Amino acid sequence: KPHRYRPGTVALREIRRYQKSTELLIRKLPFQRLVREIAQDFKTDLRFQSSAVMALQEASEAYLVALFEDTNLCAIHAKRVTIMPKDIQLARRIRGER
Amino acid sequence: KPHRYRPGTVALREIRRYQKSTELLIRKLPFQRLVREIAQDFKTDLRFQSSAVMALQEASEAYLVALFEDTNLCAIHAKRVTIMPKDIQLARRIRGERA
Amino acid sequence: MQIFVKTLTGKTITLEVEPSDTIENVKAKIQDKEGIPPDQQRLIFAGKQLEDGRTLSDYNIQKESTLHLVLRLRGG
Amino acid sequence: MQIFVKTLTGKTITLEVEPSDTIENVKAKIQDKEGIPPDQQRLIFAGKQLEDGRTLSDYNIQKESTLHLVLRLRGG
Amino acid sequence: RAKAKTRSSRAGLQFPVGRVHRLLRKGNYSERVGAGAPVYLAAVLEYLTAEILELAGNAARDNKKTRIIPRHLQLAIRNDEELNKLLGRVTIAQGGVLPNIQAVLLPK
Amino acid sequence: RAKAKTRSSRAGLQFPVGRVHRLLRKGNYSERVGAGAPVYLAAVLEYLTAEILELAGNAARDNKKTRIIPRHLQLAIRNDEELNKLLGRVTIAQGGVLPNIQAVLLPK
Amino acid sequence: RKESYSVYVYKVLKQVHPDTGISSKAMGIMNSFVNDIFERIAGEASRLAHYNKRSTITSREIQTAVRLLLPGELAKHAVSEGTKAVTKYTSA
Amino acid sequence: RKESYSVYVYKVLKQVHPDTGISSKAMGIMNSFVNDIFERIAGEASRLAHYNKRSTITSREIQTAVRLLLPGELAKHAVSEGTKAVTKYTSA
Amino acid sequence: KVLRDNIQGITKPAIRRLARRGGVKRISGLIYEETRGVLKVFLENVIRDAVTYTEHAKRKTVTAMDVVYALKRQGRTLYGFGG
Amino acid sequence: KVLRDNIQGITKPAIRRLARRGGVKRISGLIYEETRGVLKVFLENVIRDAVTYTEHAKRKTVTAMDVVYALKRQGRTLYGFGG
DNA sequence: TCGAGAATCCCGGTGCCGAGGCCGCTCAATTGGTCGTAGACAGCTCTAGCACCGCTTAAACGCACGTACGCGCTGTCCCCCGCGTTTTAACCGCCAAGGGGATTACTCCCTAGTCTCCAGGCACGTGTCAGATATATACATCCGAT
DNA sequence: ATCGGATGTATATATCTGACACGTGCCTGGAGACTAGGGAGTAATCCCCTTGGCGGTTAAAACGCGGGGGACAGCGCGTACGTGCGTTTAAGCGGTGCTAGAGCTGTCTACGACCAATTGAGCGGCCTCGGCACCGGGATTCTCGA
């Protein structure tokens, strides 16, 4: 009989693992490529200091972490356990973005 | 033979009425007494220009209206219609006031 | 019928009026002898602020009156 | 064995060195005849930046060398 | 000297270039102010106020009124989406709110 | 003349009163600045720095470390209530988040 | 001797809508808005000028502040109006 | 030569926790924090000076700016510390 | 002179009217206490800022400009009172 | 010199492991497209600020002191890069 | 499906006070000169951002299965709404009064300005131990089986 | 609940490399001392304007009650997501190179500050007529028990 953790057990372990560390979570080269192709529509030539790209990654990851915290709060408010896209839209409305 | 409106029609009529008018919904003398009571814990003697009192009332009305808008949105997101105290807390918690 | 207009500057002039004359009439009289615009004067008699539309009798301005005058500035 | 140290100012001195001498050794020699601190000099020979720990032979400094010197400022 | 011509007149503007320049000088923003900065700022302010007043007057006309009211101003600002981003943190005294009811609340 | 005694020394502070004064002058905040203002501001900054550093050092000791890390600074700031009020809109590079799991998500 | 923007707002109104009225409260709100935008743009321009080690606020700084504070097509239109006004002023 | 509060922060850290060290990233974060707080307090004091039409920033303006900015207990403690420093500076 | 219990001056019909303007069609019976609490804390913050402004101004009178500055420094700028 | 897609590079396990940091236990299957629409509206609000900072500086390089000062402008302050 | 009935749009009339127009005077915006310096521009140098290549392997990905959870439905009951009746104090108008806000004038003293001196803060180099990494081992947790 | 294999977490030991802490040398920024002069402290004065009190009206608040709709717990289902595995893919790392341009310096020209005189725009005061608020009869419009 093969070993199998029940669903929802590995998720909590991953939560505890990633709430203790400080490592940047998105892959650096894909993120930098995304930033460079986004900036292609404002200035034709840009050079994008590495420290600037690092700051962009840090800010984006912090923003996503906060947004997912608020999304989880909305999901728990809605008597759910999983999050759904409408949970993000509600959180982004109360925050006054959209 | 009493005419009786169904529960909810008068509420919607009041909503439509009160979203059209720009008056203040809180009684001026009780609000001023509340303001003077609140400020008694900072300075013993304060004078509280009537313009300042009106500005405070306008700001409080606008803030409460926005908070109730967000509370209603939370209530509808919870597949509900009535607003509840936990709806207000969630609106403030996301907004950045409930700590 | 002469009453004395005592200004804030301590210079008191001798002004001859009529019992039926008005507060406004006194204002123009000083312009005739000093060139001061009427609207730059604030007349204070008996401690109450005189009004342009009132006469010199409604306030019971007896002769030899110490009329206290305040001068205003157009702009602060 | 003499090589010429040409500064940015256009003043070129005549300096006598040894084949086994170092880049650092030249820096102290100018202090003896001009009082200039060694660390305020940037020696550029053959277009590559000389290093203090290297000798005068590793860069093949032939005689009658036009040694280009850059002077730095402590503070900007 | 020649008859004085206002900087607003020579710049083709209605807002006071001279008064904007004085406010910039007396605001402790910087110790020196460029010549064209007050002109540019006055032009921008005039454009913004014209843009808002156009929508406010349109709202007042829609409301069968010939005067612009704080309610009309609030309606214009919160109906134009580009103005709403400028004044999203601004509350207007005697401005009210727009009529909006969530669809779920309607009778069914 | 008499021996030179620094403003910070004669005020009992460790932060540069002279540098604070220079920044106040060169900041376009006001045309003039008082004598006691730089001292007062330096004292306030020193107190706030000490307040942060005490908690940061305690948190660093909690992890069996003798050096401060941005993780420790983040932990101290987010664990103190009023520092969280000062820096609630401030994100820290390589700081992470506090360990939080909502009680509903815990297994029965 | 209090000074405001009421006359200029009235002129702009008469220019845009040939016949429309302004209540006193509406004029006050317009003055408040004008002061707010002036302070916003001037503060951003001062911060910009200081970030680049400059002692002057020029049309370049004002234009970049307008671009920073104005969203969408409003920024484009404001920049166009500002540059047109500045070039007309320099022409005479 | 660049200027920062690294030395002063290190002295404060030695005063508070004599046995504790600190890293370069922490120096950067502490300099950022000090600069942010300085900017906030200085801007508040500048605004306070203009509202009363005063042309000088003094300890009174800095103190009321501290009261405006800092939260409950920290504001009180910081005002106490600053007042102590001001009296010590004036007396000595 | 001495005032107390004036937080009850925000009556139930006033809160219902505010919710009606906000767009709420049904209100539970526990909303009013929470609304009074949040209104009280918001008022305390704004009035504390206004009082410290009018105390730095060396005055005993809280003008409308003090309230305007108190709201502006919290991001809730208020047009229509001279700010 | 031309980049076209560059948005699937923010992979599904990369949106996870960040939702995990946020603190979620279960994630739907449509969260990823929403989270990619975000962070594309975001950071596009940050560029076009960082640019027109570097453009005002007449540089063509986006320094770290542009991403900072674009943050603290968007209402978020970033430490250690850094002012 | 359709009247009964309450709400609301609507169409005149009448009286009121606020917006807009007019008059004046006065002060700050303008014109016109000087003058010191801010940055515009050219030159140059040295960092570093980009572009390339190969090599290792961690991360992503497609697949398959199961289970728990979101949803949809259903039945209870309870509580908030709408309506009527009684109470109250908000509100409008009026009146008495003092206090402190705003303004003006006198003056004094505190800060910007300038020169001169020197020492403490920055750059630098160096050495050394603190956290990182690997390795082996004990302990707490999970879930399937009883 | 109880056990125990299997998994992951945590702990003790050895080494070990680079970043942090302390020195040294120097040089510009901070400190010491005196002046000129305007900013602000301070004492009066007036009067706007805020506080307190009082009387009448009635709009609004408070209370009570009947019930219909809505909150909410319950139960089934089927489907969508978590978990684990083998495979693919490109991220990560290292090393090299080049040239685009960030950054610093030298000249100097245009540009903004500063000061004297003046006048025309705009702010203050009045004033008056029409937009607008309210009253009421009016027809229309939505709701609700049939």
PDB file of N, CA, C and O in Angstrom, chain D residues 19-61:
ATOM      1  N   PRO D  19      64.827  47.149 -13.826  1.00  0.00           N
ATOM      2  CA  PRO D  19      63.958  46.165 -14.492  1.00  0.00           C
ATOM      3  C   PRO D  19      63.148  45.320 -13.525  1.00  0.00           C
ATOM      4  O   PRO D  19      62.037  44.894 -13.869  1.00  0.00           O
ATOM      5  N   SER D  20      63.666  45.064 -12.327  1.00  0.00           N
ATOM      6  CA  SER D  20      62.972  44.262 -11.329  1.00  0.00           C
ATOM      7  C   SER D  20      62.055  45.086 -10.435  1.00  0.00           C
ATOM      8  O   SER D  20      61.389  44.515  -9.566  1.00  0.00           O
ATOM      9  N   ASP D  21      62.003  46.403 -10.624  1.00  0.00           N
ATOM     10  CA  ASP D  21      61.158  47.243  -9.788  1.00  0.00           C
ATOM     11  C   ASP D  21      59.682  46.987 -10.078  1.00  0.00           C
ATOM     12  O   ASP D  21      59.316  46.391 -11.095  1.00  0.00           O
ATOM     13  N   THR D  22      58.832  47.445  -9.165  1.00  0.00           N
ATOM     14  CA  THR D  22      57.403  47.187  -9.217  1.00  0.00           C
ATOM     15  C   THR D  22      56.634  48.458  -9.563  1.00  0.00           C
ATOM     16  O   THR D  22      57.179  49.565  -9.565  1.00  0.00           O
ATOM     17  N   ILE D  23      55.348  48.273  -9.867  1.00  0.00           N
ATOM     18  CA  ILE D  23      54.458  49.413 -10.081  1.00  0.00           C
ATOM     19  C   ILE D  23      54.365  50.250  -8.812  1.00  0.00           C
ATOM     20  O   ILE D  23      54.371  51.487  -8.860  1.00  0.00           O
ATOM     21  N   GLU D  24      54.278  49.585  -7.657  1.00  0.00           N
ATOM     22  CA  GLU D  24      54.228  50.289  -6.380  1.00  0.00           C
ATOM     23  C   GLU D  24      55.495  51.098  -6.131  1.00  0.00           C
ATOM     24  O   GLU D  24      55.426  52.209  -5.593  1.00  0.00           O
ATOM     25  N   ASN D  25      56.658  50.560  -6.512  1.00  0.00           N
ATOM     26  CA  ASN D  25      57.921  51.241  -6.247  1.00  0.00           C
ATOM     27  C   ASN D  25      57.992  52.588  -6.959  1.00  0.00           C
ATOM     28  O   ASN D  25      58.529  53.557  -6.409  1.00  0.00           O
ATOM     29  N   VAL D  26      57.465  52.665  -8.184  1.00  0.00           N
ATOM     30  CA  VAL D  26      57.455  53.928  -8.917  1.00  0.00           C
ATOM     31  C   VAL D  26      56.622  54.969  -8.174  1.00  0.00           C
ATOM     32  O   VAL D  26      56.971  56.155  -8.137  1.00  0.00           O
ATOM     33  N   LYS D  27      55.518  54.535  -7.559  1.00  0.00           N
ATOM     34  CA  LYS D  27      54.629  55.465  -6.869  1.00  0.00           C
ATOM     35  C   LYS D  27      55.349  56.193  -5.741  1.00  0.00           C
ATOM     36  O   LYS D  27      55.186  57.407  -5.570  1.00  0.00           O
ATOM     37  N   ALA D  28      56.148  55.469  -4.955  1.00  0.00           N
ATOM     38  CA  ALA D  28      56.898  56.088  -3.869  1.00  0.00           C
ATOM     39  C   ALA D  28      58.035  56.973  -4.366  1.00  0.00           C
ATOM     40  O   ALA D  28      58.405  57.926  -3.673  1.00  0.00           O
ATOM     41  N   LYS D  29      58.594  56.678  -5.543  1.00  0.00           N
ATOM     42  CA  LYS D  29      59.717  57.460  -6.050  1.00  0.00           C
ATOM     43  C   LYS D  29      59.307  58.897  -6.351  1.00  0.00           C
ATOM     44  O   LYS D  29      60.064  59.835  -6.082  1.00  0.00           O
ATOM     45  N   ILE D  30      58.112  59.087  -6.918  1.00  0.00           N
ATOM     46  CA  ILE D  30      57.650  60.432  -7.243  1.00  0.00           C
ATOM     47  C   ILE D  30      57.419  61.249  -5.978  1.00  0.00           C
ATOM     48  O   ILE D  30      57.610  62.471  -5.978  1.00  0.00           O
ATOM     49  N   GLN D  31      57.005  60.600  -4.887  1.00  0.00           N
ATOM     50  CA  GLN D  31      56.864  61.301  -3.614  1.00  0.00           C
ATOM     51  C   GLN D  31      58.201  61.848  -3.132  1.00  0.00           C
ATOM     52  O   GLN D  31      58.252  62.878  -2.451  1.00  0.00           O
ATOM     53  N   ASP D  32      59.298  61.167  -3.473  1.00  0.00           N
ATOM     54  CA  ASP D  32      60.617  61.615  -3.038  1.00  0.00           C
ATOM     55  C   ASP D  32      61.048  62.893  -3.748  1.00  0.00           C
ATOM     56  O   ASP D  32      61.776  63.705  -3.167  1.00  0.00           O
ATOM     57  N   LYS D  33      60.613  63.090  -4.993  1.00  0.00           N
ATOM     58  CA  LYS D  33      61.034  64.237  -5.783  1.00  0.00           C
ATOM     59  C   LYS D  33      59.935  65.265  -6.007  1.00  0.00           C
ATOM     60  O   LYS D  33      60.224  66.346  -6.533  1.00  0.00           O
ATOM     61  N   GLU D  34      58.690  64.968  -5.632  1.00  0.00           N
ATOM     62  CA  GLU D  34      57.596  65.917  -5.791  1.00  0.00           C
ATOM     63  C   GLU D  34      56.686  66.031  -4.577  1.00  0.00           C
ATOM     64  O   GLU D  34      55.930  67.005  -4.492  1.00  0.00           O
ATOM     65  N   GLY D  35      56.729  65.084  -3.643  1.00  0.00           N
ATOM     66  CA  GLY D  35      55.859  65.125  -2.486  1.00  0.00           C
ATOM     67  C   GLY D  35      54.429  64.701  -2.741  1.00  0.00           C
ATOM     68  O   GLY D  35      53.583  64.871  -1.855  1.00  0.00           O
ATOM     69  N   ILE D  36      54.132  64.161  -3.913  1.00  0.00           N
ATOM     70  CA  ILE D  36      52.783  63.742  -4.283  1.00  0.00           C
ATOM     71  C   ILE D  36      52.510  62.395  -3.623  1.00  0.00           C
ATOM     72  O   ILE D  36      53.358  61.493  -3.714  1.00  0.00           O
ATOM     73  N   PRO D  37      51.378  62.217  -2.943  1.00  0.00           N
ATOM     74  CA  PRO D  37      51.071  60.921  -2.328  1.00  0.00           C
ATOM     75  C   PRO D  37      50.952  59.833  -3.379  1.00  0.00           C
ATOM     76  O   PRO D  37      50.396  60.062  -4.465  1.00  0.00           O
ATOM     77  N   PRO D  38      51.470  58.634  -3.096  1.00  0.00           N
ATOM     78  CA  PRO D  38      51.413  57.554  -4.096  1.00  0.00           C
ATOM     79  C   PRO D  38      50.004  57.158  -4.498  1.00  0.00           C
ATOM     80  O   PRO D  38      49.770  56.837  -5.670  1.00  0.00           O
ATOM     81  N   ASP D  39      49.052  57.175  -3.563  1.00  0.00           N
ATOM     82  CA  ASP D  39      47.705  56.677  -3.820  1.00  0.00           C
ATOM     83  C   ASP D  39      46.870  57.608  -4.693  1.00  0.00           C
ATOM     84  O   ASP D  39      45.779  57.205  -5.112  1.00  0.00           O
ATOM     85  N   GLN D  40      47.338  58.821  -4.979  1.00  0.00           N
ATOM     86  CA  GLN D  40      46.586  59.785  -5.772  1.00  0.00           C
ATOM     87  C   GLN D  40      46.949  59.697  -7.251  1.00  0.00           C
ATOM     88  O   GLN D  40      46.582  60.569  -8.041  1.00  0.00           O
ATOM     89  N   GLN D  41      47.665  58.644  -7.635  1.00  0.00           N
ATOM     90  CA  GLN D  41      48.138  58.474  -9.001  1.00  0.00           C
ATOM     91  C   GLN D  41      47.534  57.216  -9.607  1.00  0.00           C
ATOM     92  O   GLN D  41      47.407  56.184  -8.944  1.00  0.00           O
ATOM     93  N   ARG D  42      47.183  57.316 -10.886  1.00  0.00           N
ATOM     94  CA  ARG D  42      46.622  56.210 -11.647  1.00  0.00           C
ATOM     95  C   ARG D  42      47.539  56.009 -12.848  1.00  0.00           C
ATOM     96  O   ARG D  42      47.507  56.793 -13.797  1.00  0.00           O
ATOM     97  N   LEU D  43      48.367  54.969 -12.804  1.00  0.00           N
ATOM     98  CA  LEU D  43      49.307  54.717 -13.887  1.00  0.00           C
ATOM     99  C   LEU D  43      48.635  53.904 -14.987  1.00  0.00           C
ATOM    100  O   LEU D  43      48.036  52.858 -14.722  1.00  0.00           O
ATOM    101  N   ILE D  44      48.729  54.396 -16.220  1.00  0.00           N
ATOM    102  CA  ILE D  44      48.159  53.736 -17.389  1.00  0.00           C
ATOM    103  C   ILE D  44      49.270  53.531 -18.408  1.00  0.00           C
ATOM    104  O   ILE D  44      49.741  54.496 -19.023  1.00  0.00           O
ATOM    105  N   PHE D  45      49.686  52.283 -18.589  1.00  0.00           N
ATOM    106  CA  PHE D  45      50.687  51.919 -19.583  1.00  0.00           C
ATOM    107  C   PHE D  45      50.096  50.893 -20.537  1.00  0.00           C
ATOM    108  O   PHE D  45      49.448  49.934 -20.097  1.00  0.00           O
ATOM    109  N   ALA D  46      50.309  51.106 -21.837  1.00  0.00           N
ATOM    110  CA  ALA D  46      49.842  50.196 -22.886  1.00  0.00           C
ATOM    111  C   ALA D  46      48.321  50.057 -22.874  1.00  0.00           C
ATOM    112  O   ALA D  46      47.763  49.094 -23.404  1.00  0.00           O
ATOM    113  N   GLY D  47      47.643  51.029 -22.266  1.00  0.00           N
ATOM    114  CA  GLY D  47      46.197  51.058 -22.240  1.00  0.00           C
ATOM    115  C   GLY D  47      45.543  50.217 -21.166  1.00  0.00           C
ATOM    116  O   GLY D  47      44.313  50.261 -21.034  1.00  0.00           O
ATOM    117  N   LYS D  48      46.313  49.456 -20.395  1.00  0.00           N
ATOM    118  CA  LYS D  48      45.781  48.627 -19.325  1.00  0.00           C
ATOM    119  C   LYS D  48      46.215  49.174 -17.971  1.00  0.00           C
ATOM    120  O   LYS D  48      47.329  49.679 -17.807  1.00  0.00           O
ATOM    121  N   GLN D  49      45.315  49.065 -16.997  1.00  0.00           N
ATOM    122  CA  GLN D  49      45.518  49.655 -15.678  1.00  0.00           C
ATOM    123  C   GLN D  49      46.531  48.818 -14.907  1.00  0.00           C
ATOM    124  O   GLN D  49      46.290  47.641 -14.623  1.00  0.00           O
ATOM    125  N   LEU D  50      47.664  49.429 -14.573  1.00  0.00           N
ATOM    126  CA  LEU D  50      48.685  48.761 -13.784  1.00  0.00           C
ATOM    127  C   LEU D  50      48.191  48.515 -12.362  1.00  0.00           C
ATOM    128  O   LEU D  50      47.400  49.288 -11.813  1.00  0.00           O
ATOM    129  N   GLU D  51      48.665  47.428 -11.766  1.00  0.00           N
ATOM    130  CA  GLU D  51      48.303  47.053 -10.407  1.00  0.00           C
ATOM    131  C   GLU D  51      49.522  47.147  -9.498  1.00  0.00           C
ATOM    132  O   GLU D  51      50.655  46.885  -9.910  1.00  0.00           O
ATOM    133  N   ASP D  52      49.268  47.527  -8.241  1.00  0.00           N
ATOM    134  CA  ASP D  52      50.354  47.784  -7.298  1.00  0.00           C
ATOM    135  C   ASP D  52      51.238  46.561  -7.091  1.00  0.00           C
ATOM    136  O   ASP D  52      52.455  46.699  -6.917  1.00  0.00           O
ATOM    137  N   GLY D  53      50.659  45.362  -7.107  1.00  0.00           N
ATOM    138  CA  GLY D  53      51.427  44.160  -6.839  1.00  0.00           C
ATOM    139  C   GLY D  53      52.242  43.634  -7.997  1.00  0.00           C
ATOM    140  O   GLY D  53      52.936  42.624  -7.837  1.00  0.00           O
ATOM    141  N   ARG D  54      52.179  44.281  -9.155  1.00  0.00           N
ATOM    142  CA  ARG D  54      52.899  43.822 -10.333  1.00  0.00           C
ATOM    143  C   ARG D  54      54.206  44.589 -10.505  1.00  0.00           C
ATOM    144  O   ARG D  54      54.363  45.711 -10.015  1.00  0.00           O
ATOM    145  N   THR D  55      55.148  43.961 -11.204  1.00  0.00           N
ATOM    146  CA  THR D  55      56.453  44.551 -11.457  1.00  0.00           C
ATOM    147  C   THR D  55      56.431  45.384 -12.736  1.00  0.00           C
ATOM    148  O   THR D  55      55.425  45.462 -13.445  1.00  0.00           O
ATOM    149  N   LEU D  56      57.569  46.017 -13.026  1.00  0.00           N
ATOM    150  CA  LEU D  56      57.691  46.830 -14.230  1.00  0.00           C
ATOM    151  C   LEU D  56      58.016  46.003 -15.466  1.00  0.00           C
ATOM    152  O   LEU D  56      58.070  46.557 -16.568  1.00  0.00           O
ATOM    153  N   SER D  57      58.239  44.700 -15.309  1.00  0.00           N
ATOM    154  CA  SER D  57      58.563  43.830 -16.431  1.00  0.00           C
ATOM    155  C   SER D  57      57.361  43.057 -16.958  1.00  0.00           C
ATOM    156  O   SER D  57      57.350  42.693 -18.138  1.00  0.00           O
ATOM    157  N   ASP D  58      56.357  42.799 -16.115  1.00  0.00           N
ATOM    158  CA  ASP D  58      55.208  42.004 -16.535  1.00  0.00           C
ATOM    159  C   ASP D  58      54.440  42.673 -17.671  1.00  0.00           C
ATOM    160  O   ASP D  58      53.749  41.996 -18.439  1.00  0.00           O
ATOM    161  N   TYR D  59      54.551  43.995 -17.791  1.00  0.00           N
ATOM    162  CA  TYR D  59      53.917  44.741 -18.868  1.00  0.00           C
ATOM    163  C   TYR D  59      54.887  45.094 -19.986  1.00  0.00           C
ATOM    164  O   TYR D  59      54.508  45.815 -20.914  1.00  0.00           O
ATOM    165  N   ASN D  60      56.127  44.600 -19.916  1.00  0.00           N
ATOM    166  CA  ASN D  60      57.153  44.844 -20.932  1.00  0.00           C
ATOM    167  C   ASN D  60      57.368  46.346 -21.148  1.00  0.00           C
ATOM    168  O   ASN D  60      57.156  46.884 -22.236  1.00  0.00           O
ATOM    169  N   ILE D  61      57.795  47.016 -20.079  1.00  0.00           N
ATOM    170  CA  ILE D  61      58.037  48.459 -20.117  1.00  0.00           C
ATOM    171  C   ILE D  61      59.446  48.652 -20.669  1.00  0.00           C
ATOM    172  O   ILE D  61      60.438  48.639 -19.940  1.00  0.00           O
TER     173      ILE D  61
END
